[PDB]
């Protein structure tokens, strides 16, 4: 069966200081041996996260670019996420594509080289309030996930993130059953246009708001196989998480 | 007070542990001039790594950073993070920011100021397409630039100004000395009449694209070309004959 996948996304936030006393916590944590735990720092603590973290944690990168060496003043490739001794990515976070503008082509292409340079890559999809309010759930996020798709040719290095756009900031809240619904929709799209097997063992978590006392429910739903979470991940909070199906 | 000669080495998007390592023993190698202020800007990966490896004498810089301390900006990272890493400056409106990345001019004052209020250094790069050369506002478009950059700084003795035309970035097309000259004056003079006559005498205006060990001593000789922002040739052994244009 899917292992249950927790990523802690902790966004522009934290210094040495505070990251170190964070991860002095995950490090006494005792994790789950049915749980995946992937912790993923600014750009400047990658290196510095891997050194202090305990090898049962994975680190990512939380964005990178398109190719392995080049002129991209601000810019760090896969080679260099490696090199650092991170194993994963986060690719088309919602405050890459509606804050920088990222495309999808881009998006896609950076899924391509990533997965290609040997890394894992965390995909993340989801609908903005007006669309979801036009009816168009559906189609906004399968388009995403179809050039996703078309650039991933080994899916078990590959989770697929579901992130209520619509959700963050702005009057509404999504539901277990609402997050339920969108996850079950998506497996069944990678059971029709991949295969039964991918369908069966993609890890596809939920990328809107978790925290200790949501975490159980949200988990219990049976096309939900983990977490990308925001706030609560630079917090002891995010252990509760991490323990979501225990 | 003359103003300090400064070259800053910009990495862009290259090296790794191993292959930075051997560059930054050859720089810690290198004599470097007194009066020749040396800035290296490595990768946001290995700012921490570059920092702990290169001689004190050498500074290192941020490549970019945002406009706010702490945020919900998955991908970025801020000043404060900069500084904590133990480098004292941060590149901001670089040609690939604004022209690969799309960066707007009103981001880029936001992200000095920003800087600037968190005790960083900030090199603010500036220039012109091709085609705005090739239409003639060349003047027009650096002075628009610098202005939005100026309306964003209270403390010059931080900044430097880097004046780096697009169609001479990585093409090999280097400006000539005149070309170089001629563009500095007029930022100079537009310093003077729009900030003050101690800020255009003060501070440093350094000219970047296709820099090159052949190139720099004629640049540098120039009365308002004070020094270079060099990326390809930062990562090669003329870099030292850059440091050394003006002995």
Redesign the interface.
Known sequence: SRKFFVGG?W??????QSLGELIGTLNAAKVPADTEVVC?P???????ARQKLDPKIAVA???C?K?T?????????P???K??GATWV?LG?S??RH???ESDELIGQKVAHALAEGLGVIACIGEKLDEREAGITEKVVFEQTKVIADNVKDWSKVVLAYEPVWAIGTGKTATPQQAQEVHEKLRGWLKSNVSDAVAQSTRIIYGGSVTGATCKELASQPDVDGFLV?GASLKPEFVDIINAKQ
């Open positions: 996304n966004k522009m936030n934290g210094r040495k993923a600014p750009t400047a603590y990658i290196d510095f990168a939380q964005n670019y190719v060496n080049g002129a991209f003043t601000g810019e760090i490739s080679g260099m996420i090199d650092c986060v976070h405050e890459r804050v920088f503008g925001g």
